[PDB]
């Protein structure tokens, strides 16, 4: 008659054994079974690699003439409730959930005998909803926050403001043009401070919404420099609180991992996916890849189109370092001539800037891109590709640029000829000065030519690398180079803006049928043909860009984010939902 | 005997030895001083009364801790003789070992 | 020996490759029920007084 407790740790002697995290025995007992499956779905099984570097042809050909579109297995498993799941009229889905950690799937029957492949479930949140519904993980995130004593800087008003921006559809496409041309350099940002100052002032005074919340780079730069007299303050408090919360999430995540370390490295790498270095943010403007190759012990194979990448030594032969604009004072003409004399299709070389160690381990970029954005916006965003030469031609070939007569400081709209920039400025309801367009056309010298897409392949941790087949030891991820994410567009906007931009399906949080059908005519046709596609999970992206199995964030993370509530409780939920389900993560969960 | 503020109330609710570890030496094999010492004075292994924990107040349980300093017999050897000590019967090594 | 403190700090943090973590900064990390556990005996060994 002693009251004995039995917590997680006391049983840990059986949970951290590698017998638990191995799919070899599951795969044996499965493969040997008769009656293979008779439904070996093939969609999104593995990535397909292109020869042509252009993504516009990829998206066009993939959505050009489309028909009945398949939906993946996990997107179906995460749709049923628990009680409807366990009912034995949905059996083929139960039949493929033998093991909690390994998500298993069957290949195409033709070509070889029946075989099944298991891919590891990287994080807690990829556990399907009928086995861990949304409310469970909401409460678990609340519990985590109470454990680490994290104090929310962000107030709900700033989140409601972010969301009211996310559902604007009256968003100025010109603020988007500027945000696209800057592409994350300090010097060009300091070149154009009065431009964005006027922009933020007008967008915060005409309506109660704040612009430029899209790219993490503009947020960092505004908090870093324009904290001064930038705008009418009231708006600066928003950016203050945003960056403060971005740092407080890392305060908590560091407090989760112990002070104790494995060897030279700490243990914080293995417990949360955000803290791990091998994860890459979707929008990249600096040289992150080669730095990753320098830091990654596990073979971090990069794929640029058809061309592989595995060595720091080939750094010149595949990556063109974009010089600092001043150092390039002499090399402008050769760069410009390369556009007319160089075939950008299948270039297989990347134009990137020199890397800057922020001094944070890039945790902030991952936290803003993976937790804050999909929660505060219900994940309604896409990637965007741009043709920068059209942007230059719209900006520089304008009337006020050439005429030596026109003064430096005037309302361009009075002297503006009929051209697409007129319509853009009018729909963006902002009247800019001549100096600002001069500075924008000046920023052309550095800017890249087109936007590019890259694949990363990182081996898992040594704690979960136990697997039968080497292909499963890899984990795949997509990275955007020289591009930006976008909110929903308008229809009247997509008359002068289609002249410059195009839509991209992306990471689950940044893949959305609403936005992509808004931008593309063809994706709109596709969604109208098949309305069930409205959901973020059932959307079909080109395998050349997206593979639903072999990713960090599976479908259920996106499904939860679709119904995510804008409170900070759900922010805690999305934060804690990034734990890796590795034994050394179970130990840290036991400690707290 | 001083005691951490995080001692569980349930531990004092049930009859137990005030050391914070089980001190039932009859259980071990007879005449094994090493085994008896490993039962009484060790913290490499949890006490026999509660496996999940090792000791409720380590300030009295381990060798040379505060309670051991106060109420061990012949360790003082200079206290006044003639005054009974209720805690002496619990913390004395020779008496614990004679059972 | 030298009283110039800027050299002191820069000499400490210049090429530091191993960071030692003190003892008591380990105890304040663990909570109570995890502190008493017999999986952690190095730290508890020195909690006598």
């Amino acid at each position: 008659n002693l009251l004995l407790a039995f917590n997680l740790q006391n049983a840990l002697k059986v949970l951290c054994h590698p017998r638990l995290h191995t799919p070899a025995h599951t795969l044996n007992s499965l493969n040997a079974a008769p009656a293979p499956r008779d439904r070996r779905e093939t969609y999104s099984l593995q990535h397909r690699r292109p020869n042509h570097m252009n993504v516009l042809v990829i998206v066009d050909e993939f959505y050009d003439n489309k028909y009945a579109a398949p939906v993946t297995d996990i997107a179906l498993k995460c749709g049923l409730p628990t009680e409807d799941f366990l009912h034995p009229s949905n059996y083929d889905l139960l039949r493929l959930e033998l093991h909690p950690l390994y998500d298993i799937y069957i290949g195409r029957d033709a070509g070889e005998r029946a075989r099944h492949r298991a891919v590891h479930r990287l994080m807690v949140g990829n556990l399907p909803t009928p086995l861990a519904p949304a409310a469970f993980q909401e409460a678990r995130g609340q519990q985590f926050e109470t454990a680490t004593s994290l104090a929310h800087v962000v107030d709900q008003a700033v989140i409601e403001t972010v969301q009211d921006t996310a559902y604007d559809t009256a968003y100025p496409a010109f603020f988007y043009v500027v945000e696209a041309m800057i592409h994350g350099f300090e010097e060009k940002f300091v070149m154009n401070v009065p431009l964005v100052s006027l922009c933020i002032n007008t967008y915060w005074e005409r309506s109660g919404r704040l612009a430029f919340v899209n790219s993490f780079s503009m947020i960092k730069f505004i908090c870093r420099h324009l904290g001064n007299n930038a705008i009418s303050k009231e708006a600066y408090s928003m950016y203050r609180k945003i960056y403060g919360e971005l740092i407080a999430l890392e305060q908590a995540l560091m407090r989760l991992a112990g002070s104790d370390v494995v060897g030279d490295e700490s243990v914080g790498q293995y417990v949360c996916a955000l803290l791990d270095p091998n994860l890459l943010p979707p929008v990249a403007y600096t040289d992150i890849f080669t730095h990753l190759l320098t830091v990654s012990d596990r073979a971090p194979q990069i794929i640029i189109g058809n061309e592989v990448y595995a060595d720091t030594l080939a750094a010149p032969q595949f990556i063109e370092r974009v010089g600092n604009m001043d150092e390039m004072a002499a090399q402008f003409v050769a760069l410009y001539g390369y556009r007319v004399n160089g075939d950008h299709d299948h270039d297989f070389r990347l134009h990137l800037g020199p890397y800057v160690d922020e001094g944070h381990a890039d945790v902030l970029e991952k936290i803003f891109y993976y937790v804050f954005l999909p929660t505060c916006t219900n994940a309604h965003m896409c990637g965007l590709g741009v043709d920068f030469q059209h942007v230059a031609q719209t900006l520089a070939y304008n009337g006020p640029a050439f005429s030596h007569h026109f003064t430096r400081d005037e309302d361009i709209l009075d002297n503006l000829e009929n051209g697409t920039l007129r319509d853009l400025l009018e729909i963006s309801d902002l009247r800019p000065t001549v100096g600002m367009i001069r500075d924008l056309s000046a920023s052309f010298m550095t800017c890249p030519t087109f936007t590019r897409a890259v694949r990363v392949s990182v081996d898992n941790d040594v704690t979960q690398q136990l697997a039968p087949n080497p292909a499963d030891k890899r984990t795949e991820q997509t990275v955007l180079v020289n591009g930006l994410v976008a909110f929903a567009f308008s229809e009247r906007t997509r008359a002068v803006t289609q002249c410059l931009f195009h839509a991209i399906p992306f990471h689950m949080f940044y893949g959305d049928p609403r936005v992509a059908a808004t931008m593309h005519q063809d994706v709109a046709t596709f969604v109208m043909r098949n309305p069930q596609q409205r959901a973020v999970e059932a959307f079909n992206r080109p395998e050349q860009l997206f593979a639903e199995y072999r990713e960090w964030h599976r479908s259920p993370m996106g499904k939860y984010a679709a119904e995510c509530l804008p409170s900070l409780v759900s922010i805690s939920g999305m934060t804690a939902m990034h734990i890796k389900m590795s034994p050394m993560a179970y130990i840290a969960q036991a400690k707290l | 005997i001083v005691t951490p503020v995080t001692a569980d109330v349930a531990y004092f609710q049930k009859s137990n030895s005030p050391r914070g570890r089980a001190a039932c030496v009859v259980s071990c094999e007879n005449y094994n001083q090493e085994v008896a010492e490993g039962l009484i004075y060790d913290h490499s292994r949890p006490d026999a009364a509660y496996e999940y924990r090792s000791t409720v107040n380590p300030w009295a349980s381990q060798l040379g801790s505060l309670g051991d300093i106060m109420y061990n017999s012949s360790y003082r050897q200079t206290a006044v003789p003639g005054l009974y000590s209720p805690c002496r019967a619990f913390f004395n090594k020779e008496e614990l070992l004679r059972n | 020996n030298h009283m110039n403190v800027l050299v002191i700090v820069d000499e400490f943090y210049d090429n530091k490759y191993a960071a030692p973590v003190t003892d008591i900064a380990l105890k304040c990390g663990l909570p109570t029920e995890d502190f008493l556990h017999p999986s952690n005996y190095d730290l508890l060994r020195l909690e006598l007084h």
């Binding site: 049983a11 002697k13 704690t463 | 009859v26 259980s27 071990c28 085994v35 039962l39 | -």
Partner: peptide, 30 residues
């Protein structure tokens, strides 16, 4: 190898028990 050894250290993996207050211990499975 060191990851395995650290997991072994934290988990409590490995005798006899000196004194048994209740009786024959009964194993538990999860």
């Amino acid at each position: 190898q060191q990851v395995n050894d650290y997991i072994k250290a934290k988990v409590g993996a490995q005798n006899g028990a000196p004194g048994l207050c209740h009786g024959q211990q009964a194993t538990c499975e999860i």
